[PDB]
């Protein structure tokens, strides 16, 4: 029967780095593919606490996920078991870059992610590596077909806790592990939040709503 059910649950793993600053993480999560939300719970595992916003790592935890209306191809679904990678640049706007990279699969029943990440540049003093963010507002993500993947266009704003916000440049290419359907240009419209953490986010619990539209 259907490759995908209802009910998915996923593992995560990410390497990264920030600044330097070298950490892995490991967590789960759980959601309803077809009905575009999902949890999942994050600990970091090696380099706590992380010296810097926790923002920055948590669109990097998941696009089986999104609600798609019938008529539009769910490029991330159809290319399951095998799955998708993704590659990700956020330019922010004081200067500091992630770039990541993705790989997801469908494996003894559930989905697996395996994440990289590369933070350079966040100055010292800024909100980032001083955590001085809130979380981001909804999103709109652009997808469009583009040289055999989709590409995925956000600009990005980043909550300061004092008000205020902080800005981010962000595109994606998404690319199935073998040829499947790509629908035409549209948006994904997202909203993240962190819903629980502990004092020094070692243990982090995120929720994300998404949902495809014309
Ligand atoms: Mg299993």
């Not at 994904?188 to 953490?197: A, E, F, N, P």
């Amino acid at each position: 029967m259907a490759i995908i059910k209802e009910f998915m649950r996923f593992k995560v793993r990410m390497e990264g780095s920030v600044n330097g600053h070298e950490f892995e993480i490991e967590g789960e999560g759980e959601g309803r593919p077809y009905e575009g939300f999902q949890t999942a719970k994050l600990k970091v595992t090696k380099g706590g606490p992380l010296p810097f916003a926790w923002d920055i790592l948590s669109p990097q935890f998941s696009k089986a996920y999104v609600k798609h209306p019938a008529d539009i191809p769910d490029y991330f679904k159809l290319s399951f078991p095998e799955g998708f990678k993704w590659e990700r640049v956020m330019n922010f706007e004081d200067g500091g870059v992630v770039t990541v990279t993705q790989d997801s699969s469908l494996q003894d029943g559930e989905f697996i992610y395996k994440v990289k990440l590369r933070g350079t540049n966040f100055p010292s003093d800024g909100p980032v590596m001083q955590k001085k963010t809130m979380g981001w507002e909804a999103s709109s993500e652009r997808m469009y077909p583009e040289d055999g993947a989709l590409k995925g266009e956000i600009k990005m704003r980043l909550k300061l806790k004092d008000g205020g916000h902080y800005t981010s440049e962000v595109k994606t290419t998404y690319k199935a592990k073998k040829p499947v359907q790509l629908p035409g240009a549209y948006i994904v419209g997202i909203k993240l939040d962190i819903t629980s953490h502990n004092e020094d986010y070692t243990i982090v619990e995120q929720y994300e709503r998404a949902e495809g539209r014309h």
